[model samples]
Target: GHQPVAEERLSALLLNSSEVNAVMGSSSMQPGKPITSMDSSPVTVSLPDCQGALYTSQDPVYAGTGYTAINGLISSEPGDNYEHWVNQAVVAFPTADKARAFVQTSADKWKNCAGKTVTVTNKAKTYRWTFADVKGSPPTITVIDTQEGAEGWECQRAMSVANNVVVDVNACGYQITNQAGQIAAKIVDKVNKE
Candidate 1:
């Protein structure tokens, strides 16, 4: 069995708030608290399994699979008044196959809700995520989620596997260029370099 990326070096593989901004091609991002667990996951999806598509730790594939993860969410401009953020997460598994499996499972699951709307809720409010353009497979998958109502907001969710580590990103903006995969691609390159 392959061992996960050493704990000592795991954090280093994750892009900091500043680097995430540069990759997403915006400077309006502000650093938010990094988390290692989904206990405080900000939102939940109607299709419970789809939670991973939004939050890395919420992915069911990690349950009892012996994995470790770090999640970073950089904030958008304060006035935006929505979850306009770039969330990058680095998750390491016991084997490369497991890492690959995570993306594969996500791709298959997201496909079910593609071009469809799924209700998203948290403790205080509810929102809708209308998914479109669910694409890619295995080592990488990109899904864009559009929100309803004013300002026309959307998010590009991308997840990739490199060795035994998975790089996931949720890049949201008012008309984003859909660069979440670009961020994951660079992180995959970084993981390869390691």
Candidate 2:
């Protein structure tokens, strides 16, 4: 026998392939490529250390906490002549309050990381990282600009909460722009309507 769950009502807000395409910009997508779901295990994406160095091997803002299930996507876009990596996720919490709590906790953690610096070592490479800024209304959006000693890179992460769902949008590239924030805001808007 199956019992109905209160969080089941939020299923409609979960991210879909179409929505992922739309938020990430259909025209910018790589031809013949499609957004694909991540594995059942928690996906670890890139995040900047307090020093502004972008590292791909660090823990994500949201670990698997209150989420009963989590769905995610990875896609790429043509960055003029290069490729941009975009990572996204839609997580279902037990209740709307839990979702809000997750968002708030992440924002608070981000705030404390501001003006700080951390070193990330991956494989044979190392980069100094820091948080440039974190801004947004409900779900805080952070833009991270990194320097490889003297060279630079781009990345951003946006997070939002709607009902029992939380959306995460992140993009990285050699010259990443505000596109990550745009994609995240769009996802949040869609979640609000659903």
Candidate 3:
């Protein structure tokens, strides 16, 4: 028999973020401005008086407000891209507009920035391992609950009868966690010794 199988269902919370703008007219922070860390400097962000700004103010949950710097001025200001330090779920969109929209929505739901301190506690689901015998047949792997699709899915090959088979599933766009990385060796062992 194979070893104890393991699987990881990945979920991530944005630890921090900072906003930037490009058109500062030499009077503002200006484009190419290096962002400040919440732990090192004052974390200030001003979002334009758009839907995103209103949403953040009213919403109770946000993950990046402490580090997020929203460029409130809308003077043809090219916005700065979000820099992610943690390997969390990345909900991809067809276009840049859609991606930004998703980020704003997430900010509204998970962002928590106050007093220049943003603390994001992860509430996302972790990986779960399900086991079964798959001598020649592999179970269908389903990846779900992502922004791209209502349900996401993929499949893995069967592990040898001598080894344990493990399946890790998560949102199609989510980043695999470090914990999940450990299982690859066993999973391959199970599948390779044909």
Candidate 4:
């Protein structure tokens, strides 16, 4: 009863390069290679439980029960100096309840993490993100962060769930223009249409 979606099928659910660039409001963004579990990133967040807000497939939440399929890709291009980079992931669970629950739990913790300085240490280095308050609702959450020591560099974290799948995205750039949430919403709409 918990059979996961096939990798190909899950990948198909992802927005193509053109779709991502279109919804992201960038004509130059190029899609990166596919992101898979084998490439899940590693990181330690000061707000331990809130880690899900920062990562895509790396979050332990997806590795737990009810998880079905996941696939993602990063999009950026030199035209915008690659400043509007966006990494997007689509994850499937056994049921819409599980997917909805995932967003609910994350949105709560993320709200608690607002206005805080979060330190994330990865294998290569550590970065402190100056966070803004969490925004939006169930099936959708958004946050803006201005990283420490990076002048005028801000990023947006957005998440949304639909049809038993979660759409997670992290995007940053001086030219961001707050489209991370839009990206999540559009992808969710795409899933609904599917």
Please report, in order, the local distance difference test score of every candidate based on alpha carbons: 0.73, 0.56, 0.22, 0.76
The segments of candidate 3 whose C-alpha lies over 4 angstroms from its true place after superposition are 1-137, 148-162, 174-190
1-194, model 2: which lDDT tens digit per residue?
22222444443443455554565455455433332332333322244423212321123444455676555556666555444667666666778778788777767766766655555555556656656777767555465655455545556766777667777666666655676677667666666665
- Please provide, for model 1 over 5-124, each residue's C-alpha lDDT reduced to its tens digit, 9 standing for 90 to 100: 764566677776677668756666676676666445466688876776655556354676566655444556556474457777788777888778777777877777778788989887
Query: Could you tell which candidate, 1 or 2, scores higher by TM-score?
Result: 1
Instruction: Tell me the spans in candidate 2 whose CA falls farther than 4 Å from its real position.
Output: 1-64, 77-81, 149-151, 174-177
Once model 3 is optimally superposed onto the true structure by TM-score, how far is the C-alpha of residue 28 displaced, in angstroms? 32
TM-score leaderboard ranking: 4, 1, 2, 3
Clashes of each: 0, 10, 21, 0
Model 4 agreement with the true structure over 66-135: per-residue lDDT tens digits: 6666788888886645656788888877788888888887788788888998899988799898778888
* Candidate 4 Cα errors over 4 Å, as ranges: 1-8, 38-40, 78-81
Global CA lDDT computed for model 2: 0.56
Instruction: Give the range of the ten consecutive residues with the poorest summed lDDT in model 1.
Output: 69-78
Candidate 1 matches the true fold with a TM-score of: 0.85
Pairs in clash, predicted candidate 2: 50-116, 50-117, 50-130, 51-117, 51-129, 51-130, 52-129, 52-130, 53-129, 53-130
